[PDB]
Design an enzyme around this catalytic site. Structure first.
Site, PDB file in Angstrom:
ATOM      1  N   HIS A  61      -5.806   7.648  -2.993  1.00 56.28           N
ATOM      2  CA  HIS A  61      -6.733   6.669  -2.489  1.00 56.28           C
ATOM      3  C   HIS A  61      -6.563   5.690  -0.439  1.00 56.28           C
ATOM      4  O   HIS A  61      -6.992   5.211  -0.229  1.00 56.28           O
ATOM      5  CB  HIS A  61      -7.133   6.100  -3.430  1.00 56.28           C
ATOM      6  CG  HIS A  61      -7.050   4.190  -3.649  1.00 56.28           C
ATOM      7  ND1 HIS A  61      -6.076   4.750  -5.119  1.00 56.28           N
ATOM      8  CD2 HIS A  61      -6.841   3.437  -2.841  1.00 56.28           C
ATOM      9  CE1 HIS A  61      -4.969   3.174  -4.497  1.00 56.28           C
ATOM     10  NE2 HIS A  61      -5.539   2.452  -4.021  1.00 56.28           N
ATOM     11  N   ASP A  62      -5.081   5.795  -1.213  1.00 51.55           N
ATOM     12  CA  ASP A  62      -4.049   4.845   0.193  1.00 51.55           C
ATOM     13  C   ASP A  62      -3.283   5.760   0.370  1.00 51.55           C
ATOM     14  O   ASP A  62      -2.229   5.118   0.895  1.00 51.55           O
ATOM     15  CB  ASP A  62      -3.702   3.453  -0.738  1.00 51.55           C
ATOM     16  CG  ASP A  62      -5.145   2.561  -0.279  1.00 51.55           C
ATOM     17  OD1 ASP A  62      -5.379   2.373   0.414  1.00 51.55           O
ATOM     18  OD2 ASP A  62      -4.281   1.470  -1.241  1.00 51.55           O
ATOM     19  N   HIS A 121       0.477  -1.281   0.260  1.00 53.67           N
ATOM     20  CA  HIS A 121       0.212   0.269  -0.225  1.00 53.67           C
ATOM     21  C   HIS A 121       1.134   0.991  -0.030  1.00 53.67           C
ATOM     22  O   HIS A 121       0.901   2.113   1.007  1.00 53.67           O
ATOM     23  CB  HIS A 121      -1.035  -0.045   1.359  1.00 53.67           C
ATOM     24  CG  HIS A 121      -2.313  -0.900   1.111  1.00 53.67           C
ATOM     25  ND1 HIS A 121      -2.083  -2.049   2.298  1.00 53.67           N
ATOM     26  CD2 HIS A 121      -3.009  -1.323   0.227  1.00 53.67           C
ATOM     27  CE1 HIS A 121      -3.178  -2.542   1.593  1.00 53.67           C
ATOM     28  NE2 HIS A 121      -3.825  -2.524   0.698  1.00 53.67           N
ATOM     29  N   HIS A 169       1.563   1.465  -5.641  1.00 54.31           N
ATOM     30  CA  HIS A 169       0.209   1.238  -5.969  1.00 54.31           C
ATOM     31  C   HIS A 169      -0.377   2.452  -5.957  1.00 54.31           C
ATOM     32  O   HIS A 169      -1.683   1.805  -6.911  1.00 54.31           O
ATOM     33  CB  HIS A 169      -0.110   0.459  -4.508  1.00 54.31           C
ATOM     34  CG  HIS A 169      -1.594   0.381  -4.392  1.00 54.31           C
ATOM     35  ND1 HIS A 169      -2.246  -0.792  -5.218  1.00 54.31           N
ATOM     36  CD2 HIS A 169      -2.621   0.772  -3.949  1.00 54.31           C
ATOM     37  CE1 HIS A 169      -3.476  -0.471  -5.336  1.00 54.31           C
ATOM     38  NE2 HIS A 169      -3.586   0.303  -3.496  1.00 54.31           N
ATOM     39  N   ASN A 183      -4.601  -5.660  -9.876  1.00 57.17           N
ATOM     40  CA  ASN A 183      -3.498  -6.475  -9.692  1.00 57.17           C
ATOM     41  C   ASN A 183      -3.538  -8.281 -10.873  1.00 57.17           C
ATOM     42  O   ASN A 183      -2.686  -8.148 -11.831  1.00 57.17           O
ATOM     43  CB  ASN A 183      -2.912  -6.899  -8.619  1.00 57.17           C
ATOM     44  CG  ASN A 183      -2.204  -5.552  -8.327  1.00 57.17           C
ATOM     45  OD1 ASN A 183      -2.035  -5.686  -6.973  1.00 57.17           O
ATOM     46  ND2 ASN A 183      -1.827  -4.895  -8.818  1.00 57.17           N
ATOM     47  N   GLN A 240      -4.614 -16.577  -3.864  1.00 54.45           N
ATOM     48  CA  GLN A 240      -4.621 -15.963  -4.765  1.00 54.45           C
ATOM     49  C   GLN A 240      -6.068 -16.004  -5.535  1.00 54.45           C
ATOM     50  O   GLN A 240      -6.704 -15.336  -6.797  1.00 54.45           O
ATOM     51  CB  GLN A 240      -3.909 -15.368  -5.347  1.00 54.45           C
ATOM     52  CG  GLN A 240      -2.741 -14.674  -5.125  1.00 54.45           C
ATOM     53  CD  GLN A 240      -3.017 -13.412  -5.457  1.00 54.45           C
ATOM     54  OE1 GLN A 240      -3.674 -12.657  -5.805  1.00 54.45           O
ATOM     55  NE2 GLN A 240      -2.954 -12.662  -3.793  1.00 54.45           N
TER      56      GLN A 240
HETATM   57  C1  LIG Z   1     -10.075  -8.390   2.097  1.00 55.38           C
HETATM   58  O1  LIG Z   1     -11.019  -8.549   1.023  1.00 55.38           O
HETATM   59  C2  LIG Z   1     -10.343  -9.700   0.413  1.00 55.38           C
HETATM   60  C3  LIG Z   1      -9.246  -9.529  -0.095  1.00 55.38           C
HETATM   61  O2  LIG Z   1      -8.670  -9.097  -0.018  1.00 55.38           O
HETATM   62  C4  LIG Z   1      -8.439  -8.384  -0.365  1.00 55.38           C
HETATM   63  C5  LIG Z   1      -6.180  -8.170  -0.485  1.00 55.38           C
HETATM   64  C6  LIG Z   1      -5.836  -6.967  -1.676  1.00 55.38           C
HETATM   65  C7  LIG Z   1      -6.088  -5.175  -1.739  1.00 55.38           C
HETATM   66  C8  LIG Z   1      -5.649  -4.434  -3.214  1.00 55.38           C
HETATM   67  C9  LIG Z   1      -6.810  -3.505  -3.222  1.00 55.38           C
HETATM   68  C10 LIG Z   1      -5.951  -2.358  -2.036  1.00 55.38           C
HETATM   69  O3  LIG Z   1      -5.752  -2.840  -1.201  1.00 55.38           O
HETATM   70  O4  LIG Z   1      -5.243  -1.417  -1.828  1.00 55.38           O
HETATM   71  C11 LIG Z   1      -8.799 -11.343  -0.309  1.00 55.38           C
HETATM   72  C12 LIG Z   1      -9.649 -12.054  -0.023  1.00 55.38           C
HETATM   73  O5  LIG Z   1      -9.308 -13.194  -0.641  1.00 55.38           O
HETATM   74  C13 LIG Z   1      -9.384 -14.488  -0.114  1.00 55.38           C
HETATM   75  C14 LIG Z   1      -9.052 -15.474  -0.544  1.00 55.38           C
HETATM   76  C15 LIG Z   1      -9.925 -16.815  -0.532  1.00 55.38           C
HETATM   77  C16 LIG Z   1     -10.855 -16.957   0.600  1.00 55.38           C
HETATM   78  C17 LIG Z   1     -11.995 -15.569   0.471  1.00 55.38           C
HETATM   79  O6  LIG Z   1     -13.054 -16.151   0.585  1.00 55.38           O
HETATM   80  C18 LIG Z   1     -11.394 -14.921   0.411  1.00 55.38           C
HETATM   81  C19 LIG Z   1     -11.963 -13.044   0.966  1.00 55.38           C
HETATM   82  O7  LIG Z   1     -13.185 -13.605   1.045  1.00 55.38           O
HETATM   83  C20 LIG Z   1     -11.154 -11.749   0.363  1.00 55.38           C
HETATM   84  C21 LIG Z   1     -11.518 -10.885   0.855  1.00 55.38           C
HETATM   85  C22 LIG Z   1     -12.603 -10.512   0.966  1.00 55.38           C
HETATM   86  C23 LIG Z   1     -12.955 -10.283   2.692  1.00 55.38           C
HETATM   87  C24 LIG Z   1     -14.239 -10.502   3.072  1.00 55.38           C
HETATM   88  C25 LIG Z   1     -15.589 -10.678   3.001  1.00 55.38           C
HETATM   89  C26 LIG Z   1     -14.069  -9.728   4.657  1.00 55.38           C
HETATM   90  C27 LIG Z   1     -12.081 -18.406   0.450  1.00 55.38           C
HETATM   91  C28 LIG Z   1     -11.197 -19.359   0.098  1.00 55.38           C
HETATM   92  C29 LIG Z   1      -9.545 -19.649   0.062  1.00 55.38           C
HETATM   93  C30 LIG Z   1      -9.102 -19.743   1.381  1.00 55.38           C
HETATM   94  C31 LIG Z   1      -9.113 -20.516  -0.756  1.00 55.38           C
HETATM   95  O8  LIG Z   1      -9.059 -17.968  -0.921  1.00 55.38           O
HETATM   96 MG   LIG Z   2      -7.017   0.912  -0.203  1.00 58.78          MG
HETATM   97 ZN   LIG Z   3      -6.025   0.408  -2.735  1.00 61.22          ZN
END
Ligand SMILES: COc1c(OCCCCCCC(=O)O)cc2oc3cc4c(c(O)c3c(=O)c2c1CC=C(C)C)C=CC(C)(C)O4
Ligand SMILES: [Mg+2]
Ligand SMILES: [Zn+2]
Length: 323
Positions: free
Chosen positions: A113-114, A73, A77, A234, A282
């Site tokens: 935004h970040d 972050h 980014h 990404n 991922q």
């Molecule tokens: C926080 O959101 C995410 C997540 O984060 C993304 C990270 C990268 C963001 C880049 C942009 C930025 O942050 O600036 C990554 C996520 O990855 C997951 C990976 C998963 C699963 C998930 O449900 C999620 C997320 O929900 C998930 C969520 C959703 C969150 C909630 C419902 C509380 C289910 C099964 C397995 C373990 C195989 O893999």
């Molecule tokens: Mg953010």
């Molecule tokens: Zn971001």
């Protein structure tokens, strides 16, 4: 070294710009130089009477308030999101749809935004009674702070890039920017996507075959989803970029996991450097969050984003095949 940077910035309109190279070539000023290039590209300095020197001074200060110790972050980014938003704005289905002010709002939102992101999650800040969480009452904690710092910096000496907007223009840009940046909070993602699907299912295209957004609520929803897609873009990029982004997010997630251990707290999902399946995470991230969103975006702008979607799905297949 300057002509090398200038040749790389020639890709500024392409999905998959080598943003990390530009970070290197610019002396760690990807946000400054990419924003400046984009403002020059869209003539935003003439249009809004932005002194070049004011623009530069604001950009370097903003960039300065991204943390160097934060693997994901950070200012790269931000530059990446800025440039991805810029590409999405130019999609042919949105041609002539948005005003110069809205275009400025979306690009400026992406840049801030970040800003001043500490490298830990909203939930972490809430669960540790952080000053930021106390100030913001647990509600889009990071995103409110990004907005506040992003605007606060406009007040520093020779930093008001909006100084020749009318009072009414700045009010309208302030509201749009706030609405856009708050929508990057991932806890807003499901409702955001729900509203985007609804817009797709009720899509009207004009005579020219571009999108019809007849009111603020529709127009701002598109920009919210546009910047949100850019923030989650990404896994849609060429694999050598995507993998470096994964490395960075994992380093940062693991570094929150370590601090949680130091405090005896429960380790957040995907933050335990001992029980972590980077590749499965991922695949599930794409399968459950990124592909639904981007497939719905591709629907809204069909077929403009088909190459982005193809790449996402190849990348999903790639990560999956490594398991
Ligand atoms: C926080 O959101 C995410 C997540 O984060 C993304 C990270 C990268 C963001 C880049 C942009 C930025 O942050 O600036 C990554 C996520 O990855 C997951 C990976 C998963 C699963 C998930 O449900 C999620 C997320 O929900 C998930 C969520 C959703 C969150 C909630 C419902 C509380 C289910 C099964 C397995 C373990 C195989 O893999
Ligand atoms: Mg953010
Ligand atoms: Zn971001």
């Amino acid at each position: 070294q300057e002509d090398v940077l200038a040749k790389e910035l020639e890709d500024v309109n392409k999905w998959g710009l080598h943003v990390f190279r530009i970070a290197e070539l610019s002396g760690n000023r990807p946000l400054t130089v990419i924003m400046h290039t984009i403002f020059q590209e869209r003539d935003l300095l003439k249009t809004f009477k932005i002194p070049v020197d004011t623009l530069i001074t604001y950009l370097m200060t903003l960039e300065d308030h991204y943390h160097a110790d934060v693997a994901y972050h950070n200012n790269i980014h931000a530059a990446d999101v800025v440039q991805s938003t810029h590409v999405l704005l130019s999609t042919p289905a949105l041609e002539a749809v948005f005003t110069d002010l809205e275009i400025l709002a979306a690009i400026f939102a992406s840049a801030i935004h970040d800003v001043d992101h500490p490298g830990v999650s909203n939930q972490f800040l809430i669960n540790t009674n952080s000053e930021l969480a106390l100030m913001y009452n647990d509600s889009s904690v990071l995103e409110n702070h990004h907005l506040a710092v992003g605007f606060k910096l406009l007040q520093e000496e020779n930093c008001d890039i909006f100084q020749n907007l009318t009072k009414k223009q700045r009010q309208s840009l302030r509201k749009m920017v706030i609405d856009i940046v708050l929508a990057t909070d991932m806890s807003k993602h499901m409702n955001l996507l729900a509203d985007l699907k609804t817009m797709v299912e009720t899509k009207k295209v004009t005579s020219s075959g571009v999108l019809l957004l007849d009111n603020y609520s529709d127009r701002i929803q598109v920009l919210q989803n546009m910047v949100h897609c850019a923030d989650l873009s990404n896994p849609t990029k060429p694999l050598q970029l995507y993998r470096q982004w994964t490395d960075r997010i994992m380093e940062e997630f693991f570094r929150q996991g370590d601090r949680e251990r130091e405090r005896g707290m429960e380790i957040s999902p995907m933050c335990d450097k001992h029980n972590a399946s980077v590749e499965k995470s991922q695949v599930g991230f794409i399968d459950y969050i990124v592909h639904p969103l981007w497939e719905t975006w591709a629907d809204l702008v069909h077929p403009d984003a088909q190459d982005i979607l193809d790449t996402l799905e190849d990348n999903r297949e790639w990560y999956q095949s490594t398991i």
